[PDB]
Amino acid sequence: MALINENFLKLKAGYLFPEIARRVKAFTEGNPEAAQRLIRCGIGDVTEALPEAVRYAMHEAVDELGNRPEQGYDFLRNAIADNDYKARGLPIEADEIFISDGSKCDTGNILDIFGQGNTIAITDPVYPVYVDTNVMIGNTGEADENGAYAGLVYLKCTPENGFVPDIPQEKADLIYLCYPNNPTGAVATRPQLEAWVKYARENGSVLLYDAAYEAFIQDPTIPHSIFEIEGARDCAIEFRSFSKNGGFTGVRCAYVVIPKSLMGRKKNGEAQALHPLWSRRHSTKFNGASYIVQKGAEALYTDEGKSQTKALIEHYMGNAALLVEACKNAGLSVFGGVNAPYVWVGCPAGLTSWQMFDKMLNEANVVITPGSGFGSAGEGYFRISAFNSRANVEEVCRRIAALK
Amino acid sequence: MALINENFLKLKAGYLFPEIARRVKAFTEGNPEAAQRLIRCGIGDVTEALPEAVRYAMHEAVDELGNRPEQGYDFLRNAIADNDYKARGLPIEADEIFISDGSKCDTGNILDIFGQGNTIAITDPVYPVYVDTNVMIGNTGEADENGAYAGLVYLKCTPENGFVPDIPQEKADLIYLCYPNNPTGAVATRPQLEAWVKYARENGSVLLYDAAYEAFIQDPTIPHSIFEIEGARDCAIEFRSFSKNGGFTGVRCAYVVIPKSLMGRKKNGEAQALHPLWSRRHSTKFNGASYIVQKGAEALYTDEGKSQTKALIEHYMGNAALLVEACKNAGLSVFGGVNAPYVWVGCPAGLTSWQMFDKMLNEANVVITPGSGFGSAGEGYFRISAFNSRANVEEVCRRIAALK
Questions:
Q1: Is A59 on the interface with B (CB under 8 A)?
Q2: Chain B residues 292-311 within an 8 A CB cutoff of chain A
Q3: CB pairs under 8 A between A and B
Q4: B283 interface with A at CB cutoff 8 Å
Q5: Residue from B110, B258, B284 whose CB has the most chain A CBs within 10 Å, to mutate
Q6: Which of B16, B65, B134 to mutate to test binding with chain A, by most A CBs within 10 Å of its CB?
Q7: Are residues A226 and A212 in the same domain?
């Protein structure tokens, strides 16, 4: 018989979000009356998954394919290089941009170009894809009581330390930073990124910088890109998303930035550029994002596209501001809701994250994400998405206020 | 410094198709006059990448996302189960269907749920994704002079043996079969598949059955699906594509069939179902195919969709028939062009595959695929795609006849 990948059996449970969808469906089946009242603030529940400019461009592209490069089309790689980097004085070229189907895929699949035995550092709590894919490829040991896997170096982010992780004494080879952080909403300051780039460069490490929620930053002092930091070109890969941007989950498109100067080592100690490794991976294991979605994403860089995106970001951060107010008024400890389209909330005394999940589902008829789903440091908290209608978030705010 | 995946350095060259695109671009730069005359029969050059029914559905879906499950939507999983399996008396359920962005991705990424040290058998020559991804994950040794990697069991398909591989004396754990074969155009008979299912079941092996060109089969005696064979449920995964079907490369959608009954082993020898392993992989490392492309693919199962698909298949197999006639008339040994939309052609006396590639580019201004690109058994042949306009294929036929 054919040997299975036993690293999959190390996984304590199923992937968080399908595990939630299961428990919601179970509730919905048993409670048809409640199901009609249900509001989804887990992943979220967007109305306009495509702005006008993007829809127009996608219709044109559909007709174009009727009439009629894995790295991505020139027009989109150039639009990204020009608008997100060159126009901000950042040293990134179009041929360092790799267009994908989403950041979930890129952050998951980046480990394909790295070997075994690397020391992996991951911010805790964070988006659980980084941990789970590290377990699957065999970069960890078993999980403990609290679902932390041996071998991984967990950088603890708490209210105590303002959700800014202490740069470790341990020397990590790969470092996952999510900024703005999902789910805490935390942002890194310029000096904090300067210190991370210093640590990475002197240890010859790689910063895996997930900037998916970049566009929601409101504080004008906060960096958007790691390549705002001198020397980032020598130690940083950046993940960006069109889909988790402006809540247009319909724009299933993202990109990875790999400087041609970025180096790993072989077993013999000699240097090896990461750019070619990823290019080979991208062109062999992926078939490229469609012309339709790439034309959609190009539309986001038009005047009308930027105008439509800015209104949606104001709408969603308006939603977040109301969730912060309602939680504060109800006596709950609240973090974020100012630089990312979600809020991080302390569970009421004596409730685990999963117990608060069940209470909100059964009593308030509101889906939230249990904090423990984002790692051990997440226990005692939950996340509420600001990705919903204004009317639904106002309703959720009333339900949180009324929670007994 | 961070350790790279050394398995990438075992790869003799870049992935075949980007390697061709490079050599064409180089020629196009140096020869602007020739570039105007160039006809692309490598990958191919389709005009209508979307039928009417698919475009209508994609336009409606774009507007739907403006107004208001990784495994794939119910509507498409049900349409596939009902039309491609149940309506042919095949025992496949909707929950055994996994919707993806393409077969290249699925056939490449299937190795993620298998361990190391399995004996891998691959038909030679074949689509080079299977070999290259096996090299990347560390399932092989180094390449030899002819680009065959140590460890892999290569099943030789030649004119001598009618492109029928000998069922090996070696006991293989994973077996890659491509039917119709890319690039030879060969098809397996019912008794040949019966023998493969017998071998697989008695050795507890897994058949990885790539049926991407299923729709182009013209011989009514030839099986379309491995699940036409009694016992396939105990030893078979099937790969199907909407995109490599009817030449609609615009429909970036495919699916994998994993029976819930299909078993691998752990290191202690106990059984483990493959279905859950793939579900966890699919929901963690992938973000699901878009609603727009899934609505597109659904449209292919309508009366108008089947009618439009059948006309395009007749158009492309008409193209293949002309390529066979022109090659035969010019004194070239030709195989296939009857059950798949490409022809497999013997190089003129004394030319390697790459030498025939250069001759067709420089003398005829025609891109073809060198046979050696599909493995060692491919040397001395080349592939011509039937995916082009009728006028372009008639032109290519004249240019082959005029080749001196």
A1: yes
A2: 292-293
A3: 219
A4: yes
A5: B284
A6: B65
A7: yes
Query: Residues near A220 by Cβ (< 8 Å), separated by ≥ 6?
Result: none
Partner-chain residue, chosen from A108, A118, A290, that has the shortest CB–CB distance to B284: A108
B295 CB neighbours in chain A (<8 A) are: none
Looking at the structure, do residues B38 and B53 belong to the same domain, yes or no? Answer: no
Are A15 and A138 in a shared domain?
A: no
- Residue A113: list chain B partners with CB under 8 A: 4-5, 8
Q: How many domains does chain A have?
A: 2
The last residue of a domain, from among A258, A281, A301: A301
Question: Hey, how many other C-beta atoms are within 10 angstroms of the C-beta on B373?
Answer: 25
The last residue of one of the domains, among B280, B301, B322, is B301
Q: How far apart are CA B177 and CA B211, in angstroms?
A: 9
In this complex, the residue of A50, A206, A287 whose CB is nearest that of residue B101 is: A287
Q: Is A115 in Cβ contact with B5 (below 8 Å)?
A: yes
Task: Output the CA angle B207-B212-B213, nearest 5 degrees.
Answer: 120
CA distance B162 to chain A (A): 29
Smallest CA–CA separation between A331 and chain B, in Å? 34
Cβ within 8 Å, pair A265-B109: no
Peptide linkage before A183 cis (omega within 30 of 0): yes
Tell me, yes or no, whether A106 and A240 share the same domain.
yes
Cβ(A365)–Cβ(A336) below 8 Å: no
Residues B177 and B267 in one domain: yes
**Pair (B316, B267) in one structural domain:** no
Tell me the residues of chain A between 129 and 148 that have a Cβ less than 8 Å away from chain B: 129, 132-133, 136
A345, A357 Cβ separation under 8 angstroms: no
Query: What's the reported resolution, in angstroms, to a tenth?
Result: 2.2
> What residues in B contact A114, CB-CB < 8 Å?
2-5
Q: Is there a single domain that holds both residue B215 and residue B349?
A: no
HEC per residue, chain A: CCEECHHHHHCCCCCHHHHHHHHHHHHHHHCHHHHCCCEECCCCCCCCCCCHHHHHHHHHHHHHHHHCCCCCCHHHHHHHHHHHHHHHCCCCCHHHEEEECCHHHHHHHHHHHECCCCCEEEEECCCCHHHHHHHHCCCCCCECCCCCECCCEEEECCCCCCCCCCCCCCCCCEEEEECCCCCCCCCCCHHHHHHHHHHHHHCCCEEEEECCCHHHCCCCCCCCCHHHCCCHHHCEEEEEECCCCCCCCCCCCEEEECCCCCEEECCCCCEEEHHHHHHHHHHHHCCCCCHHHHHHHHHHHCHHHHHHHHHHHHHHHHHHHHHHHHHHHCCCCEEECCCCCEEEEECCCCCCHHHHHHHHHHHHCEECEEHHHHCHHHCCEEEEECCCCHHHHHHHHHHHHHCC
Pair (B12, B129) in one structural domain: no
Distance from CA of B380 to the nearest CA of A (A): 24
Nearest to A65 among B50, B108, B263 (CB): B50
Q: How far apart are CA B39 and CA B360, in angstroms?
A: 10
Residue range of the domain that includes A186: 47-301
d(CA B357, CA B373): 11
CA distances from B301 to B220, B251, B295, B348 (A): 21, 13, 11, 43
CATH code, A112: 3.40.640.10
* Interface with chain B: mutation pick from A203, A290, A308, highest number of B CBs within 10 Å: A290
Task: Please state how this structure was obtained.
Answer: X-ray
CA dist B125 and B141 (Å) reads 19
The gap between the terminal CA atoms of chain A, to the nearest Å, is 56
User: Which positions in chain A touch B15 (Cβ < 8 Å)?
Assistant: 280, 283-284
